[PDB]
């Protein structure tokens, strides 16, 4: 327990080495840039997947692997949509103010959670008015201070959404944790990886529609492994695609 303090300094020396190398949210880059990471001898399996995907996929946006990748990836996906569809933006602002009131109603720490919401709402409102542009938004999304404050909101709703439907999701949790126990340990704090259960909640809480491309080294069905959330009787096209390589998420764009 006296040794603990000196491993926090490791978990910072490593976190900062990852932090200087690449931004929280990168600019767009051609999908071929991904293939570059793989060569036909040392990593042929991945190179196949990468090459197959490039038939469908045009650009890739790298997300810093810091424990928050999934949440950061989703929020970029959303923001982008909202800058191309004004109604969507206006609809999201309205449903966000609801989350605020839903949060206090669910017994979250009042003023702190409310302030996270208020900070995101003011962000969205300034995008709507015209204070922030396409270029300013991406500058904000890269400042660690601002970016993580916004991200906290999405972590909060993922938690909110779970508690809101506890009786329903509790059997999915394991190691004998309760819904609240899982949330507080796994979803509410920063730097904590997202799992399927969290992934489902954020997507549903956000009211969006997502395809995940499961790039692993295994033989797959034609077009590779993928997963749609939510999967429906409907056939509405996914509005955000994520690339999933083991333990990591980046945002990827269909070709045009």
């Amino acid at each position: 327990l006296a040794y603990d303090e000196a491993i926090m300094a490791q978990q910072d020396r490593i976190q900062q080495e990852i932090a200087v190398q690449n931004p929280l949210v990168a600019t767009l880059a051609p999908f071929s840039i991904l293939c570059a990471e793989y060569d036909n001898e040392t990593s042929a399996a991945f190179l196949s997947k990468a090459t197959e995907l490039s038939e469908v996929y045009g650009e890739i946006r790298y997300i810093r692997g810091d424990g928050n990748c999934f949440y950061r990836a989703i929020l970029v996906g959303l923001i982008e949509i909202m800058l191309k569809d004004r109604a969507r933006l206006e609809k999201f602002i309205a449903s966000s103010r609801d989350w605020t009131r839903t949060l206090v109603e669910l017994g979250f720490p009042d003023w702190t959670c409310t302030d996270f919401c208020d900070f995101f709402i003011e962000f969205l409102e300034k995008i709507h008015s015209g204070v922030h542009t396409e270029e300013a938004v991406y500058t904000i999304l890269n400042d660690d201070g601002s970016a993580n404050y916004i991200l906290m909101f999405f972590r909060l709703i993922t938690s909110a959404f779970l508690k809101q439907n506890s009786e329903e999701y509790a059997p999915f949790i394991d190691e004998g944790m309760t819904v609240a126990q899982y949330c507080e340990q796994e979803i509410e704090p920063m730097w904590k990886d997202a799992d399927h259960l969290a992934i489902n909640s954020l997507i549903k809480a956000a009211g969006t529609r997502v395809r995940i491309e499961y790039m692993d080294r295994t033989a797959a069905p034609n077009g590779g492994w993928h997963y749609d959330i939510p999967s429906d009787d409907q056939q509405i096209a996914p509005e955000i695609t994520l690339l999933y390589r083991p333990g990591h998420y980046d945002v990827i764009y269909k070709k045009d």
């Binding site: 006296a2 720490p109 003023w111 702190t112 993580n148 507080e184 704090p189």
Partner: protein, 149 residues
């Protein structure tokens, strides 16, 4: 200036207080917090007052406050150099928590004499094998150190 999370949290922590705890910012650094926790009812630390130092790191609230005891204290959670062993200051920290949470929790380690103590200190094992001797020691150390001027 500062991020809003500190500005607001100060204002709220001054206009509302926490019963048993004085907590005011340093006049020179707004991230520096001087704290006196007065020893709680029916606990070995009855009648003594303990100074603490809280600091808010650059990345706060995305990482816990740094908190240390100045006033020397016989306790299985607090060592020679004043360092506090508390879950919500390491593993269980959430940005939804705040200074008020840290304070209450620390207070409740004494309050509320938290034993604690399923961990391994030289103080903790003494508190394990016999409550009797250990509880009195902490009454003695309150007398020697926690008071007064």
């Amino acid at each position: 200036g500062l991020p809003r999370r500190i500005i607001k949290e100060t204002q709220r922590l001054l206009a509302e207080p926490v019963p048993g705890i004085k907590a005011e910012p340093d006049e020179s650094n707004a991230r520096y917090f001087h704290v006196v926790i007065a020893g709680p009812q029916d606990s070995p630390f009855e009648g003594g007052t303990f100074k603490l130092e809280l600091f808010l790191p650059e990345e706060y609230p995305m990482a816990a406050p740094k908190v240390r005891f100045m006033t020397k204290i016989y306790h299985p959670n607090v060592d020679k150099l004043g360092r506090i062993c508390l879950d919500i200051l390491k593993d269980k920290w959430s940005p939804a928590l705040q200074i008020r949470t840290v304070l209450l929790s620390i207070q409740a380690l004494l309050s509320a004499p938290n034993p604690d103590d399923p961990l391994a200190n030289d103080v903790a094992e003494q508190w394990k094998t016999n409550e009797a001797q250990a509880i009195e020691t902490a009454r003695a150390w309150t007398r020697l150190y926690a008071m007064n001027n």
